[PDB]
Amino acid sequence: KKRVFSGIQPTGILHLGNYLGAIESWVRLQDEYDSVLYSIVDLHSITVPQDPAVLRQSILDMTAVLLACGINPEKSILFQQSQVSEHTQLSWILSCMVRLPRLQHLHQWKAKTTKQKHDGTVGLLTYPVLQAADILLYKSTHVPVGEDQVQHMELVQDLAQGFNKKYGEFFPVPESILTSMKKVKSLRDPSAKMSKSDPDKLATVRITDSPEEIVQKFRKAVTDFTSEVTYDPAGRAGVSNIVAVHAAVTGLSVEEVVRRSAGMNTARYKLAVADAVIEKFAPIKREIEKLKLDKDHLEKVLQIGSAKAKELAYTVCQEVKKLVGFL
Amino acid sequence: LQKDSKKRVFSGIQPTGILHLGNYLGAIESWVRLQDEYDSVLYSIVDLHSITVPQDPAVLRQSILDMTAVLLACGINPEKSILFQQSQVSEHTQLSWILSCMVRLPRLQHLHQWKAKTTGTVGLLTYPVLQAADILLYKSTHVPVGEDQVQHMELVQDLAQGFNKKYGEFFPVPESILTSMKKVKSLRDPSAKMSKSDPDKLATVRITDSPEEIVQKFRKAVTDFTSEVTYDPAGRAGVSNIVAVHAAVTGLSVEEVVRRSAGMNTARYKLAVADAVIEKFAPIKREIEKLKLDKDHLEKVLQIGSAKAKELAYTVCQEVKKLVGFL
């Protein structure tokens, strides 16, 4: 059977990259596939230190945001990763199949400075394995992610294959789902992806930002000194990112938005894109504001989702234990 | 040093391999005794730990049953202690993940066990973290182990303290219990500990060994060619190990066995120790043989024990989750 799985960390506020890279896919997917699971991955969150009150609130906030984006709990299973014990159990098993250098040499770790590598947690080092577990546990076939997680998907595939080699065919080898906006760039540093953890508030366009805030971020967005608007990602990273965003939020092609902007300079154009983003977000923000007020419902939503996931997970984990030799 | 009110003993053994003199003198004998000295005692067959070395599932399966027989035979009493299967309690890996988010890679890399085995998997690298979780999960205060695990125990204490520093005093900082026989030496290499994983059958005195086998192993035991029997670990490692075993099995002191052996050559002396070991093991071996006959009973003992552990564990893990911010 086919099944979609994807995850998002509760920490920070959901932004334009998350939305274009993945969340939009999630919403579409729920109507295309019979079985769909979306997880707020709180376990992944703590790979970096979290304040407990902040984390608790982020989970609630993310729940509101996802619902506001269109995730329907009648159609998908929206759940809290920590509430399903099986994730870590499978992760352990998987970790017994992975050599340390495989993890060390993943770009997301490898890129770090020697110091940063000395400072990061073992959880941070190992999250791809947990990620593999999150996916494999439900025998998922399709996984929507951003570009930064592609390498991890290969590991997930290798893990499925490796388990299968040993114990016989058990796990489907999952496939990534990527969008054109797989790597939305930071507004302030177009070399970098847009991130929830970016300390620079200007860089990141959040779902909950005011129109005034969004316009300002686009006003401050780094471009270049060419007046005309063109799409040229190698040449003009910031402008191209902005154009791409525009195309994505409008449903027009890059070629069309560039066409429509003739005679408009970048500076003006950037504010246009901001207006487009504001429109796309606006209904979502209205719903979030409504949802934020009923904590109980948000908690209930996760609880029920978590119960549904647990039923699925328990069954698989028992099968896994038998294959391994535990039972 | 241990000044928490509720005392609890925790210890674990890997199902894989054949229990040997070092396991028995180092740990297992202790366990039996402890079950009478402490009101709460947990002994875990740590199957999760075994798979840090790839296992054949049939072999692992059988190993678990066999370890259960061996422990019962040694005198572990399931109405006095909780004898359980690690894998049946999901909380261990849950806690382990959280702890792994509080430790850095170099700390793990520098551990002697890791360095020794890898001169290697993520699971192997991180077993000490799981070990900490195994202990901490039950708010255990006392941990009987051999010498080879002492370094790991210092990490367990550090992890408890780390968690406590962050979230408030929650975990007791456990203490090792060590015997005189904390490092029983290999009969063929007195510089090395006796190990289940040692390929050289002669080095290892197994619980299931025959009297002829045991006598031969002592006969072949490596030692010096000084005729008299003395205790001198620095200068006479092999002989001293044999003397120490003799004293442990008999209940007599090292100083006493040496005096009684006055007028005895080393060769005859070694065989005398062998006889003493055979006698100690003989009832245990008979019971093992009997217990192996009823697999349903062995399975049921673990099942019952695992259910008891699960209830204890669930309660703690929920508390931990609240502290962390998951709940």
Ligand SMILES: Nc1ncnc2c1ncn2[C@@H]1O[C@H](COP(=O)(O)OP(=O)(O)OP(=O)(O)O)[C@@H](O)[C@H]1O
């Ligand atoms: N700039 C981006 N463009 C497209 N997709 C993205 C972008 N940033 C994150 N994603 C995707 O969003 C999903 C959730 O990732 P995550 O929760 O780590 O968000 P994040 O913005 O990277 O936050 P953090 O900075 O805390 O890691 C993943 O599939 C990830 O690939």
Ligand SMILES: Nc1ncnc2c1ncn2[C@@H]1O[C@H](COP(=O)(O)OP(=O)(O)OP(=O)(O)O)[C@@H](O)[C@H]1O
């Ligand atoms: N030679 C020894 N002397 C005393 N205690 C030992 C000895 N070897 C192991 N132990 C103890 O026995 C317990 C179980 O360890 P374990 O199950 O790993 O046995 P092992 O013989 O080391 O097997 P392996 O070689 O597969 O690791 C631990 O507390 C360990 O410290």
Ligand SMILES: CNC1=NC(=O)[C@H]([C@H](C)c2c[nH]c3ccccc23)O1
């Ligand atoms: C720091 N952990 C992490 N970052 C990521 O981008 C992934 C995401 C959040 C993730 C965790 N489990 C998943 C399962 C399927 C798709 C994405 C994820 O994990």
Ligand SMILES: CNC1=NC(=O)[C@H]([C@H](C)c2c[nH]c3ccccc23)O1
């Ligand atoms: C390979 N894993 C491992 N080797 C050891 O000696 C320890 C033992 C078996 C262990 C696992 N969990 C424990 C909790 C308390 C005391 C010992 C252990 O772990």
Ligand SMILES: [Mn+2]
């Ligand atoms: Mn991320």
Ligand SMILES: [Mn+2]
């Ligand atoms: Mn419009």
Ligand SMILES: [Mn+2]
């Ligand atoms: Mn060992």
Ligand SMILES: [Mn+2]
């Ligand atoms: Mn006797």
